[PDB]
Amino acid sequence: ATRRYYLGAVELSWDYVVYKKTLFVEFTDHLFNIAKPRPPWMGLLGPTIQAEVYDTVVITLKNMASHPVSLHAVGVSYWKASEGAEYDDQTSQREKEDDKVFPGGSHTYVWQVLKENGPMASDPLCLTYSYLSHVDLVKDLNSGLIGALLVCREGSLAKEKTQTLHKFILLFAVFDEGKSWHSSARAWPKMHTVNGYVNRSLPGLIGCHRKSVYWHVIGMGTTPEVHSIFLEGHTFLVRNHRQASLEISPITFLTAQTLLMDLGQFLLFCHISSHQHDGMEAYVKVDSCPEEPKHPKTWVHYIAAEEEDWDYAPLVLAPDDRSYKSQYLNNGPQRIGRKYKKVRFMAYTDETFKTREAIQHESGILGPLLYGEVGDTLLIIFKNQASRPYNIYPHGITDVRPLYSRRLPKGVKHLKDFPILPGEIFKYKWTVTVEDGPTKSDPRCLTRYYSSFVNMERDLASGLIGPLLICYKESVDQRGNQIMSDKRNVILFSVFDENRSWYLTENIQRFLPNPAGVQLEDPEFQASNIMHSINGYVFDSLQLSVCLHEVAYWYILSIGAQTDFLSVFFSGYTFKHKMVYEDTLTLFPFSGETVFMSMENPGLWILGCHNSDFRNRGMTALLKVSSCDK
Amino acid sequence: FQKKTRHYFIAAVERLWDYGMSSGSVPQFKKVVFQEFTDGSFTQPLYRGELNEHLGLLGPYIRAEVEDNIMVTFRNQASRPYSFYSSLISYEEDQRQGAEPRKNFVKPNETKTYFWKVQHHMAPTKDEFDCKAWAYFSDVDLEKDVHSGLIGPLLVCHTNTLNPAHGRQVTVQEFALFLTIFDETKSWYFTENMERNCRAPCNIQMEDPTFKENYRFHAINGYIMDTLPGLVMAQDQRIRWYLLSMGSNENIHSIHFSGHVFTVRKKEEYKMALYNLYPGVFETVEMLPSKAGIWRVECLIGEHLHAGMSTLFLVYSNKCQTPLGMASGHIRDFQITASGQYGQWAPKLARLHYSGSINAWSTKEPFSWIKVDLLAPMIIHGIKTQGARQKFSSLYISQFIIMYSLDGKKWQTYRGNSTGTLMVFFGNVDSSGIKHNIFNPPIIARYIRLHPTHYSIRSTLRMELMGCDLNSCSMPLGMESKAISDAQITASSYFTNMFATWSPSKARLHLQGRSNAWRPQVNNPKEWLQVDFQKTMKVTGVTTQGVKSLLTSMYVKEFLISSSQDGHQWTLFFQNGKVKVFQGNQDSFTPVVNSLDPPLLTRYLRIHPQSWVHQIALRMEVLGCEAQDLY
C-alpha cells in the first residue's frame, strides 16, 4: 500500500466566550474547500493519520496564516528533504525548504515507516505518536498546531476492515494564550485544558459497555507542567504494566486501555490542587450495544476516626530564630518542637470501641495497615469519635458497598459522599476482585490508600490517612510461602497544610500563646504550617530501625504534598521497582508505587527525596542498619 | 575467565564555560568539574580522546563488570571541599564510634580513597541491556555541587562485555547525555560576579531580571549553547545512549532525536520516539541510525529548546571513502610556512605516486610538518602515506602523529581509539611503502598537519587522503561499476560505421576498446549526452575525461549541464549569475574533480559540451546518492 493525506494548515476561531487561535485543517483541497471528520472527540486536531509498518505517507500542507509554519513528525523516519525542522543540518538548497513553509506557502511531505520504527514484538498493538509543527516551537504550539499520528503492524486496512476496535485520541494539552501567535487595562491572557475543552467543557462521544476501550493519549505543553489523570475503572494498559492513574508530563505519549461497568458518565480529573480550578474534564456515557441486532480470606477492621495531638519533631529539637526550621510552628510567640491537634484514623479491638489498639510508632500519623488479596472481602466497621463528622473510602477497590444492603444512605449518590456523624458507626464492605489487583506483570502488591471524603483535604490534611494494600493470591501455596513472608512496612511522603485543617484556629487558641493580636492570613505564617513530613515525623524525627541481610518490600506514596512531584532518595541504597534496578523513585500525587530492597549497606543513611528544596523544609528521616540475631 | 580490580585515578578541578561558535562580549565562568588523571602522582591531565569528548563539561567514564572491583583514589583541588558518591558505595562493617559518623568529606589536597565489590545490586539483568547507567556526584552539597559541576557517569556491565581495548565496543559506540539547567545562586559564584563583569563600571542588577543561568544555561553537558561537540557515529554500528537528567524540580526534560527511533528495555523491549527524562532516572536506550547525514538532539519542551538544546549529531556512511584528491585535487594547494625546504621543495609536489627525480616532500628538519587546506570541513577516514628514492638512498618517514584543525585557530593532537596519550602512526619502510593508515574513529577537519617522529635520511613524504563530505556522498554513482545499464543512457546522437560504434553507452570513466567512448554523429555545441536514473538522485559533480583513439587525442575542454524531473523538459545549471562555464579536460586520459555549488537534486542529468579539442569525446562518471524518491 501507499497512503496520501492532502491536508494543509489554517487559521480558525475557537471557544469552549473567550480566545481564538490557529489550528490544523483537514480538507480534500487542491484549493480551499470544506472537509470535516471532526464532530466528536476531534478538538483542535489535524486528522488522526494512520500508517502501517511498511507504508509511505504523503502529507502536502497548504499554509494559510500570518505565521511561518512547519510540519514535523516524531516516531517515524524520513529524508533530510522533510524533517520540517529549521537549523543547519547542512542541507542543500532544496533540502531546507521543508524546514519552514514561508507564510501562505505550500509544500509536499515525504514520510516513511521502516521496519526499524514499527512497534516492538510485544507492546501496544499500535503506537502513540503525534505530528508537531516547529519553526518557533513555543509559538507554533501554544497557538494550536498539533495532530495525532499512528503507526502499527501489518494489518489495519485489512485487520480493522474485519476487526472491531473502540479507540479515541485524547489530547491532554495546556495552551497558554500569552505564549500564542498573539499579543486601565486589566485582564491578561489565559487557558489550561484537555482536548481544548476548557474549565469544565465537555467534548463528545462514548464506547460500548461490556468490553474494552483504547485511547492514544498525547501529552502537551510549552513548559514542565505535570498532570495526573483519572476515571472509574483502573486504566490498566501502560505496557500491560498496570496503572492506578495515567500520569502525564511535558511531552508524553504512550497508549492505554480500560474496561467498563455502565451508563454512568464517568468523571474525568486532572486531580491536582493548582491545575484544578482552571482544569480538565470530560464524560463517558458507557451504553448498551449495537453489535447485537486454602481459599479466599475475609478480613476485619474496627477503625475509628479520632482526635489526638501531634508532635511532628519530638525526639530532636533545637530551634530559636536560628534556622528555617526554627521558624516552623505557630508564627507568633510559640515555635519550639512543633505540636498541633490532629484527627488520625485509629483502629480498635471490637464493637465495644474501648480497647486501645497498640500503636506503630513508626507509622506516626498513618492509619492501620489495610490488606486484602484478590478474592477477599474487607468488612470494615467504622466509628467516628471526632466531633466534626467524616467517613472512609479506599482509593483502589471498586466494589465498595455498605455491609448488608446495596442501599444508598437514604439520600446520597455514593458513600464517599456525606455519611457518618459524630458517634454513629457504619459497617462497610470492600470486596476485591482481579481487576483492581496486580497482574502477571506488576509487583505482587500494588500500593494504594484510604482517605476520608466528607471534605477532600480540608479533611485529609487534618490527619485522615491510612495505607491500603491490594495483592496477588497466596496461602501455604503460590510463591514464597515455605519458611516466612517477612513483614510489611510503609513510608508516606506527605505535606500537611495546617492552613486548611478542620482544626484551623482551634489550634491557635491552643499552642500559640496570645491571640491578643488575633493575626491570620500572612506571608510567613501561612508558610509556617506547611508541614513537609514522612509519616508526620519531620526534620530527622523518628527515623526507622532495620538491620543488614534483612530483606523485605517497601510500600511508598505521595499524598497531600501536591502541585508537584517527588523524586525519592535512600542514601547508598538501591531498589528493584518494576523488576529493573533504579536508585530513585519518581512519584506524582496519586503516587502509589511498590519497591523491593536487599538491606546490606551498614550505616546511617539520609533517606529523603532527590529534590533539595523540601529536604531542607524538613522532609527527611534517617535509617539505621547493623547485624541482628534471630 | 577472571575478575578485575579496576582503579580510576580521578580528581576535581576548574576552568569552565566557553561559547564562541558563530551565534566579542562572551563571559568567563569558573565552575568545578571532575577530571581523570594518570596515576597517584596526579600529573598527566589524561587528554580527553576524540572518542569521548562529548563527555566534555562533566566527568570521565567509570566502568565495571558484574563480579568486579571498583576503586577510586581521589584528590580534591578547590575551595569548598567536595566528595565522590554514588549508590553502590558499599561501605563496611562498624567501629568504636559515636552514633556512626559515616560522613564522606574530602578536604582540599587530602586524598580519600574508596573501593568496594560491585555486587549484582548494581548490575543489569537478562531482561535488560548489555549495560545499565548510574550517576556519581559530590554529596557534600548534592543541591549546589550539581549546578557547581560534579556530574559523573558510571557503567555497570554483564560479564564478558568489556575488553583489553578499555571500555566495550562489541558493535557498541556509547554516548552519555547530561540534561540539567545549571544556575549560579549555587557554588562559590560570588568569585564570579565581582571577579569578572565588574570594575569601576558596576552596580547594575543585584538579583532583579538578571538571572545569569536562566539568562543561559540549559545543559546537555555544559557545551550547551545550541551546539556541543563529539557526536560521531557510523550509520550502522548501533549506538547506545546513556540519558541521565539531574538538577532541580522543574528539571523534567523530554528529549528525542529527529528522524530516528530507539528501543528501551524494562520488562521487555518496547519502541519509543522520545523520553521524559526525570531527575534521578538514569536511562539506557539503543538505536540503529540507518538514515545517513547530519542530525540533532533537542529537549522538545518548547521553552527549553528556545534557550539551548538544538545540539547536533552526525551520521556518516563508511561505505563512503574516496581519495580526497591528491592526484585529482589542487595543482599547488597548501604546504607549510617554514617547516619544509630542500630546493626540490615541499608539497607543491608531495603527492602519492608522483613520478620523476624532483618528486615529493623533503626536509632535514628535527622539527617539521606539512599542512593541507581541504578548503571545507571534511570527513577524513585515513591517509595513504609513501616515501621517495634518492641517489642510491632509501628515504622515508618511519613514524608520525596527526594533528587537525576544523577552524585554523586552536589545534590539537589525535588519539585514535583508546590508544594512550597520543596517537603514534607507523610510516613506510621504503621508497614505495604505500602504508594506507586508517583513522580508527574518523576525523572531521579542514586542516591536517603531519609531523615526523622518525625519518630515514630526510623527513620525506608523498601522500593521499581518505574520506569525503559529511555526506555529500562523494562516491561514484554507478558509471564505473556499471550499476547504470547500457540501456540507461542515450545521447543526442552516436557516431557509427563498421570499424566503430561510439555509442553513448560507452561514456565510462575508464573504458578500453576499439570504440571506447561516446561520440556524437557530428560536432555541435547544442549537442548533448543524457543519463537517466531509474530513480530520484542527489549529485555532487560529474567526473569528465577524453578518449585515446589510437588515431589522435580526443577530449572536451568546456561544458554545461542540465537537470530535469520530468525527463522531457529541462531546467539547466546556473552560477550566481549566468550559466556555468565548466572547467573541463585537457587530455586523452586524466579525469576531472568537477563538482556543483548547489548540490543538484535530479533524475535526468544531461551533459552539454561547449568547447573541445579535436572531436567531441566523452568517457565520464557522476558522483552522488539519493534523497526521497521522486516526490
Ligand SMILES: *[C@@H]1O[C@H](CO)[C@@H](O[C@@H]2O[C@H](CO)[C@@H](O)[C@H](O)[C@H]2NC(C)=O)[C@H](O)[C@H]1NC(C)=O
Ligand atoms: C472557569 O473559568 C472562569 C474564567 O474566568 C473562572 O472564573 C473566575 O476565576 C477567578 C480566578 O481569578 C476566580 O476568582 C473566580 O472564582 C471566578 N469568577 C467568576 C466571575 O465566575 C471559573 O473559576 C472557572 N470555572 C470553574 C471550573 O470553577
Ligand SMILES: *[C@H]1O[C@H](CO)[C@@H](O)[C@H](O)[C@H]1NC(C)=O
Ligand atoms: C592544594 O590544593 C588547594 C587548592 O585550592 C589549596 O588549598 C593549596 O593552595 C594547594 N597547595 C599548593 C599548590 O601549595
Ligand SMILES: *[C@H]1O[C@H](CO)[C@@H](O)[C@H](O)[C@H]1NC(C)=O
Ligand atoms: C577502534 O574503535 C572503533 C569504535 O567502533 C572500532 O570500530 C575499531 O575496530 C577499533 N580499532 C581497532 C581495534 O582496530
Ligand SMILES: [Ca+2]
Ligand atoms: Ca531539512
Ligand SMILES: [Cu+2]
Ligand atoms: Cu493538571
Ligand SMILES: [Cu+2]
Ligand atoms: Cu528540557
